[PDB]
Amino acid sequence: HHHHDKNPGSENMTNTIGPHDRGGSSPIYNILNSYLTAYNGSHHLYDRMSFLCLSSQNTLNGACPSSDAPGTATIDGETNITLQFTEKRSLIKRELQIKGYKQFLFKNANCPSKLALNSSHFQCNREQASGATLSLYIPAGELNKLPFGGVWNAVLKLNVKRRYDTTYGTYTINITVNLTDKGNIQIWLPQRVDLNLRPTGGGTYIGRNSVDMCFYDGYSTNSSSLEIRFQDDNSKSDGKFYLKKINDDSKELVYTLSLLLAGKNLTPTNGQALNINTASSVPVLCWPGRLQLDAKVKNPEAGQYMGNIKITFTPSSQTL
Amino acid sequence: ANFMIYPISKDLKNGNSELVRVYSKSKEIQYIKIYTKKIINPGTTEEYEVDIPNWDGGLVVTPQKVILPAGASKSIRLTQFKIPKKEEVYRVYFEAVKPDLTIEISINIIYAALIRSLPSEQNISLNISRNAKKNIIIYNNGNVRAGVKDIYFCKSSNIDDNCVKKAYNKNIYPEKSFDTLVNNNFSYVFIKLNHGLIQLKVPA
Ligand code: NI
Ligand code: NI
Ligand code: NI
């Protein structure tokens, strides 16, 4: 229980939190761990430190009581702070809860009760305080309130005050939060398809269609690798996809697939598995992809044909 | 595709069980079937999967089928039946059931989560041997899988700058050996792993 002298004043700090994955529930995350705001051996002007928010309704810089607590009785507890977090690359904004409390310091006594930021002062064993500590933290489970992984940022401003007296400065705290979401992978076809089949020269036909798709894998991760498989039930171990006349298993027609996914192009056989290096609660934004179907058929019998294709999404084993 | 799953990967340890939730972004109610495959020879070129019943297989997955209301999520419970001596890896597929001249091609998305069934005390042991070609082989002695990134081949006990570096980024699973493909006769090796081990290299 040894403390150094210190005078309060404006401060600027940066606090980094995590990496924390989104998948597991957020634990408690410390922004300040009983940070010393003031202390003094000789006098007792730091016997009633209060910490006020700039606005009580404005969440930009944290919203919490902006005035000294009215009653003589202390408020034992924590102060709730609503603070606006902005993801860096999207500029999307979400408001999270922050918990804050002070703690008073006495020369000859130890009385460590937690007080709300604007709470009134007290004396321990009829002794006045000499300084105060300040703790601020993200509660458990708060980072799971964020809609998607990414670098979320915020700035907190608290005024440092002697209660019902002079304001000493303003603490600006820069809080960066690195959310991970590593187990997050999705695919969407924003919109079954028809190959719009038409004849060509020689009794040949040609059809071509394509589906646009939404595709995402959990980000701010390290480089990850995924596995995709394309299969047709009417898989004969050829590696070829087939369309059988409905009602006529005897007749088969052949078609092919190609996929451009986020700038990368591939044609898969029927049963092949493809690794995708990503270097090449879930999130809506998606890197673009397009599966394209194609077919060339000569002398084909009329009547409809149908084809079903399973596209399996998996992490692969030959990864890290 | 009208759904998604969280999560894509999970490790079950200590006999404890975890959950994989399935999300409906369709507004029309759907039915999901769940089934598991055990992965044989994982990390290798002869890797294959085979079906296991849901109760007497390494892992127990409940439920096997679900009603997926629109915009809601169900929960699927993964728990290890019996903790295993060495790591085991499974895939749990989430397919959907949709049954109630032209061409119609219905397109369908299936998710398979990669689940590691982990052993009780985790150890990693890497043994080196040399191949007929005299290439250097790495056997996973350790129960848990290896995950090597790069291998600094070395002329002598200390690395310096004359030692060859080749990056691999390939996992090594227990009881499996991996050929680095090198037949020249270096003395040691240094290995980094995903989150500096030094070992002698056999000249046989
Ligand atoms: Ni009162
Ligand atoms: Ni583009
Ligand atoms: Ni449920």
Residue numbers in the entry:
A (entry chain C): 20 to 210, 216 to 304, 321 to 360
B (entry chain A): 0 to 99, 110 to 204, 212 to 220
Can I see the authors' text?
Colonization factor antigen I (CFA/I) is a representative member of alternative chaperone-usher fimbriae in enterotoxigenic Escherichia coli, a major cause of travelers' diarrhea. For the CFA/I fimbriae, one subunit is the single-copy, tip-locating adhesin CfaE and the other is the major pilin CfaB, polymerizing to form the helical shaft of a CFA/I fimbria. In addition to the two structural subunits, biogenesis of CFA/I fimbriae requires the functions of two factors, the periplasmic chaperone CfaA and the outer membrane usher protein CfaC, which bear functional similarities to components required for fimbriae that are assembled by “the chaperone-usher” (CU) pathway. We demonstrate that the chaperone-tip adhesin complex CfaA-CfaE is essential in early fimbriae growth.
When compared to native CfaA, the mutant variant containing the triple residue substitution T112I/L114I/V116I on G1 strand (hitherto referred to as mtCfaA) formed significantly stabilized complexes with CfaE, CfaB and CfaBntd (the CfaB variant lacking the N-terminal donor strand). There are two identical copies of the mtCfaA-CfaE complex in one crystallographic asymmetric unit. The structure was refined to 2.77Å resolution with Rwork of 22.5% and Rfree of 26.0%. In the structural model of the complex, the loops containing residues 100–109 in mtCfaA and residues 311–320 in CfaE were not built because of poor electron density in those regions. CfaA interacts with CfaE in the canonical DSC manner via a pair of parallel β-strands: one from the CfaA G1 strand and the other from the CfaE F2 strand. Compared to the mtCfaA-CfaBntd structure, the mtCfaA-CfaE structure reveals a slightly more open cleft between the two domains of CfaA to accommodate the larger CfaE adhesin. The differences in hydrophobic side chains of these residues in CfaE, especially for the residues F353 (M130 in CfaB) at P0 and Y20 (L221 in CfaB) at P5, lead to a shallower, narrower groove for binding to the CfaA G1 strand, which is consistent with weaker interactions between the adhesin and chaperone. The main-chain and side-chain oxygen atoms of CfaE S357 form hydrogen bonds with the essential cleft residue pair N180’/Y182’ and the conserved residue E46’ (residues from CfaA are marked with’), while Q358, T359, and L360 interact with T43’, N180’, and N203’ through main-chain and side-chain hydrogen bonds. Nearby the adhesin subunit C-terminus, residue R253 of the C2’ strand of CfaE interacts with residues E48’ and Y92’ from CfaA, contributing to anchorage of the subunit to the cleft region. Upon binding to CfaA, the dscCfaE has its two domains re-arranged with the joint angle measured at 161.4°.
